[PDB]
Each structure stands twice: as C-alpha cells, then as structure tokens.
Design an enzyme around this catalytic site. Structure first.
Site, PDB file in Angstrom:
ATOM      1  N   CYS A   1       0.822  -1.202   0.000  1.00 38.70           N
ATOM      2  CA  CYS A   1       0.000   0.000   0.000  1.00 38.70           C
ATOM      3  C   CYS A   1       0.861   1.258   0.000  1.00 38.70           C
ATOM      4  O   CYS A   1       0.452   2.287  -0.544  1.00 38.70           O
ATOM      5  CB  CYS A   1      -0.974  -0.017   1.191  1.00 38.70           C
ATOM      6  SG  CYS A   1      -0.247  -0.325   2.829  1.00 38.70           S
TER       7      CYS A   1
ATOM      8  N   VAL B   1       0.273   4.431  -2.504  1.00 34.55           N
ATOM      9  CA  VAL B   1       0.004   5.799  -2.079  1.00 34.55           C
ATOM     10  C   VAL B   1       0.998   6.772  -2.699  1.00 34.55           C
ATOM     11  O   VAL B   1       0.618   7.863  -3.140  1.00 34.55           O
ATOM     12  CB  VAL B   1       0.018   5.889  -0.543  1.00 34.55           C
ATOM     13  CG1 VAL B   1      -0.117   7.340  -0.089  1.00 34.55           C
ATOM     14  CG2 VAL B   1      -1.110   5.053   0.038  1.00 34.55           C
TER      15      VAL B   1
END
Ligand code: ICS
Ligand code: ICS
Ligand code: CLF
Lengths: 476, 522, 522, 477
Positions: free
Chosen positions: B152, B156
């Site tokens: 993740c 991002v």
C-alpha cells in the site's frame, strides 16, 4: 574451521551482483576471541538489500505485534487497510489471563479497514468515529492505542490530534503510535517508537501520585512478553526469592501495572533490544536502576537470581539460595535424562534480537554446541554481547538472506536448527530437525527452571525423532 | 515445579496451586481488574439483542474481519506459474506476513521477495529498489519469471510499475526478454481475492496482448481453467482428474498444487510444477475459458472476452451436485467429449451418500463465512442436503452477489430462515449465533473464538465450529482436502454428518442421565 | 408434551421435568434399585487394580468380545466374486445377522441366502435343503456362482457339503457345470477371519485343483493379490491404484469394492464387479501370489504354495511407511517394474506430514484393538510416528503372532511401555484404560462404551475413541476410508493428530481458566 | 391398483420360481376383500421358509434373547454358544433403559460363553457353571441371570436346566434356562413363546405367597412394549396422567422386580399381542387378571385406547381420560395441520415383524396417507385376522415375503414410501423410493403416544419430501 568458514562465506557471495555482494560481505563474520568490539568485524541495523528475501518484518510488527499488542486490558487499533492486523492476529503467543471481548482483547483484531475513500479524504474523521464505537461496544477497556500502518503518515493524517481531542472529550487514555512500516529498517525501530509512546502518553500518569504502598523489594520484569507463559515461569522464581513483581512489560501486562512501574526499586531487563530505551529513560527520570538478566537454562537462571539478589539485603540473598536448592533436584533430573541424548549435537540459530545469544547457555547445559547464530534486526551492542556467548570460529550472520541460510546449512550440516515459521519447513525437507524459537513450536514455556524441562523435552523429541531416518526411500 | 517423568507444558502447568496463587496476587495487587461480577454482567450483555443492534450500527470500526488484503492473493496466483518468484514492490514487512500466513495454513515453505522500500522512497520513489530488486532476485533465486505486485505504501506514493520495470530492462538490470508481468494491488481496494484477479489478468496480458494477430479461437482444442484464489490442494487436483477422465484437453492457468506439496526427501525445492509460460502464450487458442470462481474474476473475464474473444460460460463454482452437473455438461458441450461412466458412477455414489445420511442432516442450522464463490457453493450444497444456512456472512461480498444468493435461497424451502450479510465481520457474526443460535458454524480458524464465547454462556448455548475455508491454522493437513466436484461434496457431507453425530455422542455420554440415547448404531 | 415448531426426539424429550418425575416414580416404586451410593461404590471398584486382577482371572466368561464367527468372513469373501451369491448351509437366523451387520457398516445392501434348516434337518441332515436351496437360489436370483459355507448347526450335525452338492447336481437340481465352491466354516473355531481364509481356499481349489497340468508359473506375467477380510473400500482401491501406477499386471482375487458401493441412480444392482471365474482359473499362471493379510490367510497360503507352486513373499500387511516400502520393493522385484516417480513422491509427502506433525504425536499413549494384521500394522505405524501403543489387544490373535508384535515393539524405544494381549476382550481393555490410562483409544464402535465409562469416573479420566476398524456403526461413510499404503498412513496420521488437537482445544476452551493456551495456530 | 391388477402381479412374479417353491409361495400371498373376514380362508402363515429364497426372518434366539429377555435391564443375559449370535445382536435393538451400565444394568453388554471346539466335544455345562461364578464375582449387583441357548446347546445334549437349578440354589439367585436354539421353530415367533414360558416357569411366581405389595384399584402393567427409542415412556406418561399406576413394563426398561410384581395388577395392557399373548393368557388363567389389546400409534388410536382402558375403571379415571385427551388435543392437531398437507395421498408399503405391519396404519391415515401393501415376517393367522380389519380393500398382503418378491412388488406398485428393516433400506433408496426404518425408527422416535406422533410425522415428512429423491437421474442420462 575458521579457514573453511571464511571460504564458505566467499563461495556463497559469488552468486550476488556486485553491489549486493559488497554489502552482504559486511554482515557475515567468523567469531574471533581476541576481537571484542563487534563494530570491528560486523555491521548491523542497516537497510535490507532489495530482492534477497530478508526474514525481517516492519516497524508495525515491532510496535503492535511485539510491544503494545500484549497489553491485555487496552484495545489496539490497526489503523489502516485490513492486511496488517489480520496477518498479525494471534500469531504471537503473548499469553494472558482475561475474559476476551469483555475485559481483555489481545487475540482480537480491531481495525479501521481503510478504503480508497479514506486515502482520498483522510482517516482522521473515521478514527474519531471508531473510538466512539469502541467505547459503546467495549466499555470495560482501560485505554486505546492507535497503531499506524503505512498509509497514515503518507497521506498526512494527524492521529495525535485525534488522540488528544478524543482523550480529553472522553477522559480516556488514547495513545497515538507512529509505527508505520516504512519507518526504520526492521521491527527494531518499532520497539523504539513504541517505547517513546509509552513514555509520552502512559508512563507519566502517576508521576506525582503516591497512594501506592511501596516496599524495598519492588521490581518490574521489563522485556518479557510471556511467550507460552515465559514471564509467569520467571515471576514465580523472583517472588519465591522474596521480590514483589509490580509489573510485567508487557506479557500478560495491564496498563495499571505499567503506570505503577515508576514506583519500583529495580528494573529487571530480559529483552535488552526491545526495552533498553524505556529502561534508560526510567533511570534518567526516576533514578531507577536497571540490570540485564537471563532465565534460559539452569546455569544462567541461577547466575541471574544471585546477581539480582545481590542488589538487595541478606534476607533476599538467603531466600535466593533457598530457591536454588529447591529446584536443584528437578533440573538435575532433566539434565540426567536429556543431556546424554543431546550431547555433542551442533545447532544453528537465527532469530530476532535477543534469543540468538540468550539461549546459548541452555543448549550448553544439555551438552549441545551452537556453531552458528544470527539476528534479523540486532544492533552492534547486541553483537558485542554475542561474542562473549559464542564459541571461537563460529559463524555470525546479520539479516541473513534466504539463500545464505540455505547454503550455510548445506555446508555446516547442523544436527538442529532453531529459527522461525518462514524457515521451519525448508529445513525439515532437507532432513534437518527444526524447532521454532519464536513460537516455541506451540510448546513452552522455556524460561526458568520449569521452562528448562520443557525446552529439553522439546529439543530431544525433535532431534531424536524416528521421522528423520526415513527421508530416503530404500530404493532412492 | 516439574516431575521429570511427566513434564507439563503451559497447559496444565499454570493450573498448579502455586501458579494459581501467584496469578491471583498479580491480579489483586497491580492489575486494577474489574470485579468478576462486573465482567459477568458485561459478558451477558454482549450476548443480547440490544447489544446486537448497537453492534450492527457500526460504521467506522471493524472487529475480527473475515478478509485479507490484495497482495496476499497476488502472491498465491503468482506461485502457480512455473519457476516464478512472487515479488511485491513496496515495504518488506508485508512479505513477512504473507509468507507466514501461508506457511501456517499449508505447513510448507512459501517463497516471496520484497524490494524493501523505506521512508526515503516516499520522496524520490522506488525506481532504484526495482532495478536492484529484479537483478538481485534473478541472480540469487534463479526464477524464470518474476510476477510483480505492490504494497500500500507503493500505491500511495504512486510508483508507476510499468515504467519502473521498463527502465530496469532498458538500463540492463535484467534481460529484455525476461518475463516480468505486474499488477497494481492496493490493499485499500477490495480484498485478497481482488489481488488474485489483478495479478492473473496482469500475467494474461503480459503474454498475449501484443500477440493476438497470431491466434485462432479453438485451434489448440483445449479449455482454459482459471481457478481463482484456492487454498485446498484437492481442488486443483479434482478438476484436473475430472477433465482427464473425460479425455478433455485443458490448461489450468495458475496451478500451485506441486509447489505447495513438495516431498520431504532430503532437498528443498523452491519451485515445482506450475503453469508454463507457453500455456499462457497459447491460451487465446483455446476453445473457451472457464472461471471456477467467477465472483472474484471479473477483470480476468473482461480480458479473456475483450481480447481473447472467448465466450466465458455462465457457470457457478462446481460445488455440490447441481453445479458439478452443470460444470460437466458445459465442458462436454464445449469439448465435444461425453461425460464418461466413471463420473456418472461417482455422481450416483454421492447421491447414495445423500440418501444414507439425510435424516441426520435434515433441518440442521448453520452459520458460515468465507469468500463469495465458496460461500454460495456451500449454501447451494447445504440446501441440497436439507440443511438450513441461517447466517450467511461474506465480509468481502457485494450487492450483486448477495442478490444471486438470495435468489438461490428463495428457490428452496430450506432457505426460508436464512439471511445473507455483506460487509459484516465475525464480531457481527458472534452476535447472530447468540441471538438466533444455529447448530454449527462452518468457517475458518477464527471461528474457534466464537465457539469459546458461546460455551462461556453455557454448554447448551455452545456452537461447535466445523473447519472449512481459509485460513485453518489449528488443525493439521486439512489443506489437502477437496471441496469441489462430487469428490468434494462427498467430503463435506461426511464432515457435516459426522460433526453432528460427534456432538450427539457428547450430549448422550452421561451415564444414567443422557446415555439412554447413546446408540451403538446411528 | 411437544411444541410443533421444535419437536424433540428421545433426547432431549425425556429430560423434560414430567418425564423425569415419571421415571423417578417408576424406579422408586417398582424397580427395587440398589441405592445410588452402592452403585457409585461398585463403579469405583470396577476401575481399580483389584478388580482388574479378578477380571484377568476369567476363564469361562467372555464380555464384550472383539471378534465375530467364521461365516461372516466367508460371506464377505464370496461377495468379492462376479455375480456370486453367498449361501450359508444351515439355520436362517445366522444370515439375517450377517446381512444386518454388514448393512450397518457399509450402509449398502448385502445379499446372502440360507437354506433354512430346522428341527427336521437337525436329525436327518440338510441334504434336501441343499437340493431345493440351490435350485431355488439359482432360479430366483440368477447368480453365475453360489459359494457355500455353513452355520454351526450344520457343522455339529455333520452335513457333508461335498456330498450334498454333488448329489444336488446328480439329481438334476442344478446344472453339472454350474460352479458351487464350498467351505466348512464352524463358528466355534477361530473367528470371522478364519471363515474368509476357508472360503477363499475353497474357491481357489474349485477352479484350479483339477486343471494344474497345463499351467506354467509366470506365463501370464501377472501377480495375484489376496486381500483377506477387508472392510474399507479405500483399501481395495489403493492397492489397485498403486499397482496400476507401477505398470504391474495383477489380479485381485476376491474384489467386492463395486458391489459394496453401487450408485443410487434409480435401480438396485444385486451384483456388481468382482473377480471373474476366468481370473481364478488363470491364477496359477501368475508370477507369484501376495497375501495382504498373511496372519489369517494360512490355509490359502498352503494351497497356493502346495498346488500353484508359487513362492509367497514374506511380507507384512502394507501399512505405515516401512511396510509399504517393503511391499512396493518386493512387487518391483517380482514384476520387474520400477517404482515410479509418482509413488516415490507420495512416499515423500507422507514423510513431510510426519515431520510437520511429530511434535503433537510424540509420546502419545494409545490403546487399540482389531484383527491381527490390522493391529500389528497400526502398531508399526504408531512406532514410526513416535507414539506409544501401550495396550495392544487382539481377541483373535495367537501366540506366534504376539511374539512377532513383541519383537516389533522391542526394536523401538516407543515400545518400552507396551503390552500385547491375546484372547482378551473389551471388558479386559476397560480395566487397562482405567489402571494404566492412555491418551486415546483406536478401535471400532464398541469402544464408545469404554469412553462413556471413563468419563463417568471424571473428565480428567476420559479416554476418547478414535474410530478405525470394524464395525463402525455410529459414524457415516468411514468405510470409504483407507488404511493401507502411503495414502492410508496419511489418513491415519491426520485423524490422530487432529484428534489430539481437538481434545486440547476442548480442555483449553474455558474462558479465563484454561484459554490462555487456546492458540489460534498449532 | 385394482384387484385383477394385483392378482396378475402375483402370478407374474411367481413365474420365476421352481415348481415346489411356486406352489408354496402362492399360499402366502393374497389380495384382501372386505367380504372374507377369516384369514384362514385366504392366506397361510407361520410355516417354514423355503430354502434359498432370501427370507427376511431371524431365529428363535433373536425372538428370545434379542426381543423378550435382552431388554430386562438389571439381569445379565448369557449368549450361551459360539461367539456369533451375541456379537451381531449386541445393541442392535434400541430397547431403551435407565441404568448404570456395567454395574447395575447390563443391556448393551454382550456376555457369552464363546464356545470353542472343546466345548462341542465335552459339552458346555461345566463352562456354564464356571461362567456363572465369574459373573457373580465381577457383576455383584446383577439381580438374576438368564441363559440364552444358541444352536449347538440342544444339539450336543447339554443340560442347562440342571446347571441353572443347582447354581441358582447354591447362590440363592434367579438363573433362568431358556431353550431358544435358533433351529427351533421357523422364525423369531417361537422364541417369543419359549421366552414367555421361561418367565412363567422361573420368574413370574416368585412372590405368589407374598402380601407386602400395596395394591390400588388402578394398578396396570404394560405388556409387550420394548421401549424402542423410548416408546414405552411416552405411553406410560399418558396412562399415569389418566390416573393409573403402571407397576411394570414388559420388557422395555423393565426390571426383574417389576416382572415379579405383575401378578398383583388389576389389568394387563397388551400392545404387542404376538410376542406376549402367551404370558397374558397364563396370567388370566392363574391369577384372574384380565388383559386387553390397545394401540398407541397416532392420535386416533391413542384416543380410542385411552377411552377403552379408562372404561375398565371408575368415573374418576374416565374423567382424567378426557382431561388427558383435551390437554394433548391442540398439540397433535398442530402436527396434523403442518404435516398432513405434506403427506396426503401418498402411498405406503410396509414389511415388518409381528405387530407394526397393522398397528401403524391408523397413524399413517391420520396424516392422510394410504397403506397399499403390508406384510409380516412371522405373524400367525390371528394377526392376519386383525390385519384385515385395518387394511383397505384390495390391498396386497405378503407373509414371509422373499427378497425377489418384495422388489418386484415395489417396482409395479411404485409406492411413495416403504417402511421396513435394515436389510431392506438400502435396496429401495437406490431405486429412488423414500425409505423409513420401522423397526429401529431410523434412530429416531419415540413413535408411541401423542409425543411420539409428532416425531413420526416429522420423520415421514423429512424423508418423503427430501430434495435428494429428485437427483437420482443424471441430467445427461
Ligand atoms: S521482543 Fe523481539 S523476533 Fe525481544 S521482536 Fe521478536 S518475543 Fe524474537 S528474538 Mo519473534 S527481540 Fe521477543 C522477539 Fe526477541 S517477536 Fe519475539 S521471538 S525476545
Ligand atoms: S416384539 Fe416383535 S420385528 Fe412385537 S420380534 Fe420384532 S419391538 Fe418388529 S413388528 Mo423388529 S412383533 Fe416388537 C417387533 Fe413387532 S424386534 Fe421389534 S420391530 S412390536
Ligand atoms: S440360528 Fe440363531 S443366530 Fe444363528 S447360530 Fe443359531 S441361534 Fe445363532 Fe450364531 S454362532 Fe455364528 S451366527 Fe450362526 S454360525 Fe453359530
């Protein structure tokens, strides 16, 4: 040995690209008795090389999984997407007494389950709503912690403001922890971050509160996370010696215990790596001394009990010798039974930040020899301590790669390997007895006198098991 | 203390009187514990309908989820290709967790690498990590393919996987021809099964998008089979067995059954078996492509239809009797092969087992959870057995899927008392098994804590767990089982009826109290 | 009383207060029951070493035997031949019991006839019964063969089967060419397994004794396989599967797997599959003959060696690792086929499972019973797993067998606390599990009453039953399982370790008492 | 459906038989008309089985040990002979009881003398005397022993009567010799008779000179209910709600003292006429105790039986009778309302032992079902006389039906449901015909009384309407 080991190291490193090779060479060494400053032969606590299959975890593992998660009467929020809290749900056997879901919550997974909308708009509003829902459905919780996963800091959320505002609105201890997995290089920085959060948001709560009735024999077990009951089988001995264990950091630990710790007379540190930070702080701010000890095996446990008792008066030193005499026949029977079945056998270890050195004594009490050891995330002060424990010309490896570990084992051919779950099934298929030395392979405790009996039983059942004679088909 | 000839582990060691007294003093001295009567009162409250209503009003808090994140499914998918290394571009803590999670379920090694992005990469990106990562991985572990997904953090900060990989090749870190399929796998989107779909479609496009001019549908006379996120070895094996019995040519695309079950013969095999690169390259030439778990293969479906021009059959997961029938008949139609006598007999043997066991199964009430396709197949088979699936929970399910299940329930009298839940977790489900108590739970190992909770209210309230699903961590080797086809239906039926009879034996074992019904023959 | 939407069967209906009060009034008024304190006193006495010594001094009384009578095995043997009707010369009550006994184990039809000898025939013999019985049987149920055994009435009075059958043919009741093999099967000799041996030897003789002159050992390049008394479908199948994998030509002599597992497809099939008459006629041309359960095939062995001139290999039952290894190696030598990669891999997967599960199996203590070959194989495998088979009971075992098992135990550290019992029954075993408590029992359904007894002493004294053997009446479809070969060892391993883990979960489920050790991962 | 249809059916099936078997089986097959009321004018029964035709019958040992004596819970019953009979019959019959098994109750245990060949050659009388002593040492709370003879005992000339007389006197213990050898008779039926006579000769008269029992006007005994799945308890509760005192149950959950008390009762209530009419006639002749047949299958028969029994007593019992009928009315009405629509019009074929082939018809009709065929393993003509008053016109009757016959009748009549035994169950399930075990209740029950009817209805419904029955034909076949 030494010559063969250094040749082994260089042969293994030939597979690497130039840059990886130059780096990994710095993290592999052969113990030399005349070299005591580990900063002269091995480096540690550096970033892992990409793509080499490091065994390390992240700073969230070191904070949530290791330090905070065991605190039993608090609710710990895995704040972020759903993965991290699920993979770490009840994977570590930090044991506790409680009524789970009512007054204790260790094996539960609380999360804010970030969706893409929380990435776009931020998660601070969701976290405040989450805290209210926690309070409705879990009223007997005695505090909340917020364990930040990777996205929180990257999207610019402000969990410290949420914790300050909601803590004051609700009169609740709410601890923001910035343990995002992109920080540091390993679990280790998660330890430090977590220590500082205890210091900042918990530990100064009873600073000037003096209603607790102290005694000269008040102590705290610092850095024992009660794996399989390890802290309980340590506590019982300390209290048989006449001490009062006010707190356990943090296996089976309550927030109130932690808050009472600034009131004790001595901090007993088992896991130096993970808790030296808060120990140094409590010495600087409250004048509490701290000492390192070792409850692995009869020799180290006896040595520790005497060293601890020397810090108090003759009454404790008398009770100390009483405990040593009580358990003498029990651990001598364990040695008499199992040492003959294990003596001479050679062991390679690879664990995290303490046990790769701390369990050597226990192996030697069964006549076994640790021919290699290493740490996922230790620092140079750990390796200093390791050189005193390890034998001459033994192999030392920091942040060992999967390939390195396999190739070292194929050449050294240990009788037993002690490492983790990602390693266990590799070496069993190679026909090498394996014991998990994080989870104790769902056995334990291994701490103390009662723990030594289980440790010996476990090393014996696996090393001498009939399955290891059967790997080879009689026809090949 | 310990007796050398009878060493005690934690259980029952800490039940010794001295440990009990020590723990009581720790509690009373320093834990500031709530009184036991207060614990009992709150526990009682958590079993009530009032608590359930507050529980189902949650919007922000999730408790005990029944899903994981995308990269876990991307790793599993990648493990199914020959000599392929799963590679997750991002932070290394994720990969430790993915490997350990699968380690504990399969009790096998699980190989996966990271390129160990840190705080610094959040400012200048992870390009350099990819260059050194691919070169280091290829040289050290000698895969024939590296299948790249993301954590993740990488999502991002916005790393462009395609560009990073192209530059790794352009700058010489890996050979231009070395296969490096990729997929973005954000954990804040969907769940682990979405990661499987994304990874597979990424691999399918890598090997076929730019080479479609060459292809002719049906020219290789095979049927592609896409299994989805699958953690039972017997489910890969039963599909291949059935198709081989039918004389049907097939390509199982993503096939990890060998690498998750290597022999303990003195050597470690990092790779074994798997779908070949040639099978992916040649897949557009198949007659058609069958999706075994269509409810998490939507993206894959659009690609096989949009690009390979296959007409993916409308088939449910081949679980139970009806849906295995439908699977075989459609495979017969596509392949031109008749269903052979062996499979017809096996079918009738399953039906015979149903007739033999229907009286103990009839009316039994179940709570169950898992992934969407698995759950709906379990529902279907339960209805076929005369069982009532009263609480159906799919944390990662969606509205369209819930509608399909509600339609299956509405077609059978045994669905009359059933409710389908989406977006709810096992803390929601705990409430349901208290307020509308079923006879059993069918779920993964996290269900053991629900059973513990129900026993604490009382033995008469206990809801025993039947372990079917993922992950199963507290039993050994159930990952070798089968749930698809007639074989899997036979195994589920046997487990269900015998769980029922085990519990009846427990409740009738009390001498002179309840053992009038402790029958030798059932 | 009943509530229509929640109808209660006997359990828990009779726990209702009005039934409880009724039953108390029945006891107190008219049963003249020993007072409960006296019942408690006697029960405790039955759990002591004092009672055990009296128990083992029994000479005339048998209580809860672990064996049946010969004809049961003659029927099972006969069912293994193509379109063969088992036919027991004697009294009909026997056949009702044989059929019902197998009915309950296999949950399948079991065809068998009697010729209904009565008080009449007990004096003047059952010759007329045989004439009309054979003619009636052939006309009505159209078998291709009738295999004849005897009940104990026919043995006592002395009916000459050979003469009666020859006179039935002489006088026209059945065609001269119609095959009617026979064996005498006295229930007061040996046990059910002895009947299997007698029946098989009878069939072998019927088809080969008078045709030996044109036979040549090895000319058909096959290996004969004689399974013996076998009640697991998987055991027939795993043997045929392993030999087929090896490319080994073979003939399975007595093969009932099909007739014990017909499909439910709308028609009843009295016969299905089975060893053909031509296979029995041709068996002397095989390379050799392998006995899968040699300790109850001694009569067959004499005939195979004495008449067919085969040199039967000295092979134990192929159970566990070593003995499956030895089976395959010997088959490889006899047939010249190599052991293929598929079986080598299966072996290594079994070993892998052993390494994965050894820490929970190590040291576990077991009581077990069954027939001699099955028991010694279970013993061997338990030793291979690091388990201690402390109480080994074989009611129908003999001295030479107990010596062989005692030698197996002596060769392993895990036999140090084990004892082998022959001629003892399950009331003997009950005493052992009280005085020298094991962790589990491995046995058939009759063991459930022992578990009941141990629980009545106390939860901490309860010994749970693991159901492996024959008969299993109180669980469904375990007769489909496998105990032979690597596949069977894998199934047994799984059952044992998960029985251990199930019980540990039960003992650690107590909230705030023992659930500190209620681990998610084991 | 029609008479002519069935008669042709019978003739068609019998074409397969040899001449002798054909002629015999034709006499055990009939189509009943309401005009002929003497079963002796249309069907033969209680004759030997024809050899080789796969009868469903058992033997006299099954009728004695398995049926009548086995259930007596506080006695120990020896299967005297080789090991087979006692093993196959261990706990196969669900004759339920309250006790502490192995100390004061022994029903599910298997005691045997496990004859070896030496016992055939020298006889077993010495072994039996030794066995009795071992029993006393190891089971001191047993209240009596029975010796259930297996086939060899009578064939080798043993004298178990002498052993029981000597040992019984030596030990001051009731030891009952029973000559139920399996070659005797033609079926389980003679085992019933032999067992009844053994009760009479060795047990029933023990308290003939005793006056210490406190009698009441309402003392009754339940004769011939073996408490299958609790059947007798769900009957007893109703009789005592009606104000009666049930002194004894023969022999489900029965104690030996209950048996010895039964000569003191006012009325013997006979459920199973077949197995217990012998001892019931004896008790009327010797003690003057009247006996009456009743039927607790279904609400219609149970209500009829309660009223007929209550009419043997005074107005107080008759009043409580209607209170019981009224109490249970809404309960069984709720059962019919739920299940009769789900079963109405469905056709049933039955084959059972000696009572239930007629006794359960009323309960099927209370659910709107029709019994289009029925038969008995071992019934006598007085049973068939009673069957003609229960069965509908033109329905099929079969005595000692052969396996072939039953299959062929089912194929042609195509019933919606078959109720029979374990040797029949799996044949007809494979044919796609719902099957319910009507001996063992398929491990369910009780079926007696109002509480039993609820379970009965639930069970017929769950099986008849189960989704499995529409799945036998593969969609591609
Ligand atoms: S805290 Fe640390 S990796 Fe000191 S992160 Fe790790 S429960 Fe290890 S070597 Mo798992 S520094 Fe504890 C540890 Fe040691 S989780 Fe446990 S075994 S003694
Ligand atoms: S005794 Fe008889 S065969 Fe009347 S031997 Fe048989 S428990 Fe049947 S029809 Mo099994 S005369 Fe009882 C009987 Fe009926 S064993 Fe049960 S069901 S009501
Ligand atoms: S008709 Fe009846 S059941 Fe048959 S024997 Fe005779 S009493 Fe008994 Fe017993 S032991 Fe075995 S099963 Fe028979 S052959 Fe002898």
């Amino acid at each position: 040995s030494r010559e063969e080991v250094e040749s082994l190291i260089q042969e293994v490193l030939e597979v690497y690209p130039e840059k990886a090779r130059k780096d990994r060479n710095k993290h592999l060494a052969v113990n030399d008795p005349a070299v005591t400053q580990s900063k002269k032969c091995i480096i540690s606590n550096k970033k892992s090389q990409p793509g080499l299959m490091t065994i390390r975890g992240c700073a969230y593992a070191g904070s949530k999984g290791v330090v905070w998660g065991p605190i039993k009467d608090m609710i710990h929020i895995s704040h972020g997407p759903v993965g991290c809290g699920q993979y770490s749900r009840a994977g570590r056997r930090n044991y506790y007494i409680g009524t789970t879901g009512v007054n204790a919550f260790v094996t539960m997974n609380f999360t804010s389950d970030f969706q893409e909308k929380d990435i776009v708009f931020g998660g601070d509003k969701k976290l405040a709503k989450l805290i209210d829902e926690v309070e409705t459905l879990f009223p007997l919780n005695k505090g909340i912690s917020v364990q930040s996963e990777c996205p929180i800091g990257l999207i610019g959320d402000d969990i410290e403001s949420v914790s300050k505002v909601k803590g004051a609105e609700l009169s609740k201890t709410i601890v923001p922890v910035r343990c995002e997995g992109f920080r540091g290089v390993s679990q280790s920085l998660g330890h430090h971050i977590a220590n500082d959060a205890v210091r900042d948001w918990v530990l100064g709560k009873r600073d000037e509160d003096t209603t607790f009735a102290s005694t000269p024999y008040d102590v705290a077990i610092i850095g024992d996370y009660n794996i399989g009951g390890d802290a309980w089988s340590s506590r019982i001995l300390l209290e048989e010696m006449g001490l009062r264990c006010v707190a356990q950091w943090s296996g089976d630990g309550s927030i109130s215990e932690i808050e009472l710790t600034p009131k004790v007379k001595l901090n007993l540190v088992h896991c130096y790596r993970s808790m030296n930070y808060i120990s140094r702080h409590m010495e600087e701010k409250y004048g509490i001394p701290w000492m390192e000890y070792n409850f692995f095996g009869p020799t180290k446990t006896i040595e520790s009990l005497r060293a601890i008792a020397a810090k108090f008066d003759e009454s404790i030193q008398k009770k100390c010798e009483e405990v040593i005499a009580k358990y003498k026949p029990e651990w001598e029977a364990v040695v008499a039974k199992y040492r003959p079945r294990l003596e001479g056998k050679r062991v390679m270890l690879y664990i995290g930040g303490l046990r790769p050195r701390h369990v050597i004594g226990a192996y030697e009490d069964l006549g076994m020899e640790v021919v290699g050891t290493g740490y996922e995330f230790a620092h140079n002060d750990d390796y200093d301590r390791t050189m005193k424990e390890m034998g001459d010309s033994t192999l030392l490896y920091d942040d060992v790669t999967g390939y390195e570990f396999e190739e070292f084992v194929k050449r050294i051919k240990p009788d037993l390997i002690g490492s983790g779950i990602k390693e266990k099934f590799i070496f069993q298929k190679m026909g090498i007895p394996f014991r998990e030395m994080h989870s104790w392979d769902y056995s334990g405790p291994y701490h103390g006198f009662d723990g030594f009996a289980i440790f010996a039983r476990d090393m014996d059942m696996t090393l001498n098991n009939p399955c290891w004679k059967k790997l080879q088909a009689p026809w090949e | 203390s310990q007796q050398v000839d009878k060493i005690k582990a934690s259980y029952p060691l800490f039940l010794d009187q001295d440990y009990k007294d020590m723990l009581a003093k720790k509690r009373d001295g320093f834990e500031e514990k709530y009184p036991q009567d207060k614990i009992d009162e709150v526990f009682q409250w958590t079993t009530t309908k009032e608590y359930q209503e507050l529980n189902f009003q949650r919007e922000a808090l999730t408790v005990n989820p029944a899903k994981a994140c995308q990269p876990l499914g991307a790793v599993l998918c990648a493990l199914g290709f020959e000599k392929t290394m799963p590679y997750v571009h991002g932070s290394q803590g994720c990969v430790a967790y993915y490997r350990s999670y699968f380690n504990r379920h399969f009790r096998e090694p699980v190989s996966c690498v990271s390129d160990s992005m840190t705080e610094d990469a959040a400012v200048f990106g992870g390009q350099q990590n990819m260059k050194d990562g691919l070169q280091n991985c290829k040289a050290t572990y000698k895969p024939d393919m590296i299948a790249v997904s993301t954590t993740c953090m990488a999502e991002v900060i916005g790393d462009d996987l395609n560009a990073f990989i192209n530059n790794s090749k352009k700058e010489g870190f890996i050979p231009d021809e070395f296969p490096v399929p990729f997929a973005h796998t954000p954990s804040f989107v969907g769940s682990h099964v979405t990661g499987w779909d994304n990874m597979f479609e990424g691999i399918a496009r890598y090997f076929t998008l730019k080479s479609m001019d060459d292809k002719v549908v049906g020219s290789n006379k095979k049927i592609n089979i896409v299994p989805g996120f699958e953690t039972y070895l017997g489910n890969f094996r039963v599909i291949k067995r059935m198709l081989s019995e039918m004389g049907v040519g097939y390509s199982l695309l993503s096939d990890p059954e060998e690498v998750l079950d290597t022999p303990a013969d003195g050597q470690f095999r990092m790779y074994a078996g798997g779908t070949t690169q040639e099978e992916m390259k040649d897949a557009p030439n198949a007659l058609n492509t069958v999706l075994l778990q269509p409810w998490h293969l939507e993206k894959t479906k659009k690609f096989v239809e949009g690009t390979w021009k296959h007409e993916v059959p409308k088939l449910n997961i081949p679980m139970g009797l009806d849906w295995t029938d439908e699977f075989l008949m459609k495979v017969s139609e596509i392949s031109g092969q008749p269903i052979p006598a062996s499979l017809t007999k096996e079918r009738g043997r399953l039906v015979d087992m149903m007739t033999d066991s229907h009286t103990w199964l009839h009316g039994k009430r179940f709570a169950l959870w898992g992934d969407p396709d698995f759950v709906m197949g379990l529902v279907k088979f339960l209805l076929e057995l005369g069982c009532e699936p009263v609480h159906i929970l799919c944390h990662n399910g969606n509205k369209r899927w819930k509608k399909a299940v509600d339609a299956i329930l509405a077609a059978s009298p045994y669905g009359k008392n059933a409710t389908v839940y989406i977006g709810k977790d096992l803390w929601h489900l705990r409430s349901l098994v208290f307020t509308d108590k079923p006879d059993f739970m069918i779920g993964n190992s996290y269900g053991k804590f629900i059973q513990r909770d129900t026993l604490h209210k009382g033995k008469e309230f206990e809801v025993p767990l039947i372990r079917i699903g993922f992950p199963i961590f507290d039993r050994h080797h159930l990952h070798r089982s089968t749930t698809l086809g007639y074989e899997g239906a036979m195994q589920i039926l046997t487990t269900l009826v015998n769980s029922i009879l085990e519990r009846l034996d427990e409740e009738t074992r009390g001498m002179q109290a309840t053992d009038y019904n402790h029958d030798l023959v059932r």
